[PDB]
């Protein structure tokens, strides 16, 4: 996960935050659809 400010707009910022969430949030352990953080990577 990388954020380069040169090529940065609202769209790429949200994509970056989106990727952080996907990599940190559990695929399986969710409550009301909200993921719990993973225990390990």
């Amino acid at each position: 996960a990388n954020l380069r400010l040169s090529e940065a707009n609202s769209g790429t910022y949200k994509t970056f935050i989106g990727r952080v969430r996907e990599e940190l949030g559990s695929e399986t352990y969710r409550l009301y659809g909200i993921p719990v953080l993973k225990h390990s990577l």
């Binding site: 609202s10 969710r30 009301y32 659809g33 909200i34």
Partner: protein, 264 residues
């Protein structure tokens, strides 16, 4: 602070922001419950237990087709059968009794002192409830793709995405306990899914609030603004094209044109 909650006392609000209220503070094993202006009165406090029971004034909410008809009452908790005092609350705002699977708590009229009743579940705004102690409507902007804001257009008759402008009155929405999304300047007006279509999907517009099952919305954790239920549909910017001026009700797929943010 602990991961187990034994009991809690809160309010239940819904239809037009009114509160579930046991009529007149009566305690007779059979008294009736109405919608009434929300206040701090003890007959509007409801206590949830690990039973699955919901209680006001010491007596618990009940429904028996024989006993009280399809009307909803409080009785003595030991005097009637367990099956009739069970309750389940869903994320979409449906309050129902697990044993009577087709029915759901309803308020057939929008008026003060209306009798609450069990009716067939059609996922109507008259069947939408907020369990929680903050009863007021949540005011904010609704932000969609390209960071554009939902606007009430054409003298509060239509709606689509415009550029956000802070404090613009037409961009301010009120989210009610019944699951309605209302025009902030005019609370008789509800975001509504029409029978009129675009690319074979219903189009969203502003009509008079009438308590029906196309004025009821739930904000979920996937970022969607959805209809309650299993056969779920999401608010959707047609063709991911802001310029089309068309918000439709589409099959859920979770892409950017179906993602929204409440900016409160």
């Amino acid at each position: 602070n602990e991961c187990i909650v034994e009991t809690r006392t809160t309010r239940i609000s819904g239809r037009d922001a009114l509160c579930v209220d046991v009529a007149g503070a009566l305690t007779s094993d059979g008294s009736r419950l109405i919608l009434y202006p929300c206040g701090q009165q003890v007959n509007q406090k409801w206590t949830f237990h690990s039973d699955g029971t919901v209680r006001s004034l010491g007596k618990c909410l009940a429904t028996n087709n024989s006993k009280f008809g399809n009307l909803v009452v409080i009785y003595d908790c030991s005097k009637l059968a367990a099956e009739d005092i069970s309750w389940d609350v869903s994320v979409g705002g449906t309050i129902m009794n697990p044993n009577y699977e087709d029915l759901a708590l309803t308020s057939n009229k929008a008026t003060r002192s209306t009798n609450l009743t069990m009716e067939v579940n059609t996922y109507s705004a008259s069947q939408g409830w907020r369990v929680g102690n903050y009863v007021q409507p949540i005011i904010g902007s609704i932000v969609g793709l390209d960071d554009m804001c939902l606007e009430a257009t054409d003298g509060n008759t239509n709606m689509w995405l415009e550029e956000c402008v802070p404090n613009k009155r037409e961009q301010s929405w009120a989210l009610y306990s019944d699951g309605t999304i209302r025009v902030d300047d005019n609370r008789e007006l509800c975001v509504t899914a029409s029978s009129s279509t675009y690319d074979n999907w219903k189009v969203i517009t502003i009509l008079n609030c009438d308590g029906s099952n196309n004025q009821r919305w739930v904000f979920l954790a996937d970022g969607s603004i959805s209809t309650p239920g299993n056969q779920r549909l999401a608010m959707d910017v047609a063709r991911s094209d802001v310029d089309l001026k068309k918000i439709i009700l589409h099959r859920p797929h979770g892409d950017l044109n179906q993602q929204w943010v409440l900016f409160y």
